[PDB]
């Protein structure tokens, strides 16, 4: 037959998964493009600075395009139609190129965002010494072009194969990577470390230092240059410490399992692993890509809805279209 590529999955479970992906796609698309146009009108409303406005725009743009690009194909050809795979050989090579570039965009983008959050407080002179509009534009174009260039290896690695019992079969074409096993181990370790490890270190250490300095100011003005926000010394700084730690735990909890599963595919031996894990792996893929898309949707509300001012303009604009 062709049952070697039969992803044994419960249909009710796959239905529930597809409901979750559909809901996340709706709220992510709507909230992300609403955040984009809200923020662009906030340049037209706050009207004084565009320092990190471009960073948040790039992040919302990344999240929007990764949701709308990756979610259809990752719904159908992976969760639903596992065996035939009907969306094109160079098409699927480009598809893996796209999701790799988008993950890299979001990764290095939230990294550079947090580095800017650090550089604002730690060196209040050096941003005005460097970060002009030109510096920010060149900076985010640099981050974006790096995210484009690092993705090139997956286009050279993620092949396609009619890997059925014969060559010609019913739907035996299945977009698996076609490189050697050492090669895919190298590129998956490269993608994993380069996409997450030093983003984890950079985001974690920088936001940890930011939380430490904020807590030190909270302790120094707990019993009361000067830099004091007296009604928000409890309220605003409490929200600040909460959202800083929240952003890093959100990021860690949301992206650890995904390429953790990639590395599970990588450091996997056929002799070593039985079929029991296999079914758990397909289910784990469902849960993993689910959590990665809620990663793609979570960051906008924590970077706009954390403020009330962006929530003010966002209520003004989400009420405007509807």
């Amino acid at each position: 037959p062709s049952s070697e590529l039969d992803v044994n999955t419960d249909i009710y479970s796959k239905v529930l998964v597809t409901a979750v992906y559909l809901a996340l796609f709706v709220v992510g698309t709507v909230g992300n493009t609403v955040t984009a146009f809200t923020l662009a009108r906030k340049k037209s409303l706050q009207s004084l600075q565009s320092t990190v406005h471009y960073h948040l725009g790039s992040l919302a743009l990344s999240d929007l395009l990764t949701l709308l690009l990756a979610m259809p194909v990752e719904l159908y050809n992976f969760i639903w139609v596992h065996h035939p795979w009907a969306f094109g050989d160079a098409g699927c090579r480009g598809y893996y190129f796209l999701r790799d570039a988008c993950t890299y965009a979001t990764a290095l983008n939230v990294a550079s965002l947090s580095v800017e959050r650090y550089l604002a407080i730690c060196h209040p002179f050096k941003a005005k010494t460097l970060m002009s509009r030109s510096r920010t534009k060149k900076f985010i174009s640099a981050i974006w072009l790096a995210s484009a260039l690092l993705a090139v290896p997956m286009l050279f690695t993620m092949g396609e194969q009619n890997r059925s019992a014969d060559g010609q079969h019913a739907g035996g074409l299945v977009c698996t990577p076609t490189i050697h096993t050492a090669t895919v181990k190298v590129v998956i370790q490269v993608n994993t470390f380069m996409s997450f490890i030093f983003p984890m270190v950079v985001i974690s250490v920088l936001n940890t230092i930011i939380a430490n300095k904020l807590t030190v100011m909270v302790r120094q003005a707990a019993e009361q240059f000067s830099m004091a926000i007296e009604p928000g010394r409890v309220q605003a700084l409490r929200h600040g410490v909460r959202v800083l730690r929240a952003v890093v735990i959100a990021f860690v909890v949301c992206w650890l399992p995904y390429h953790v599963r990639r590395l599970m595919f990588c450091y996997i031996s056929d002799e070593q692993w039985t079929p029991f894990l296999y079914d758990f792996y397909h289910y784990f893929y469902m849960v993993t890509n689910a959590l990665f898309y809620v990663s793609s949707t979570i960051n906008p509300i924590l970077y706009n809805l954390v403020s009330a001012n962006f929530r003010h303009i966002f209520l003004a604009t989400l009420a405007c279209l509807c």
Binding site: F78, C175, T176
Partner: peptide
């Protein structure tokens, strides 16, 4: 069989 999808 090693999961083809990745």
């Amino acid at each position: 069989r090693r999961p083809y999808i990745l």
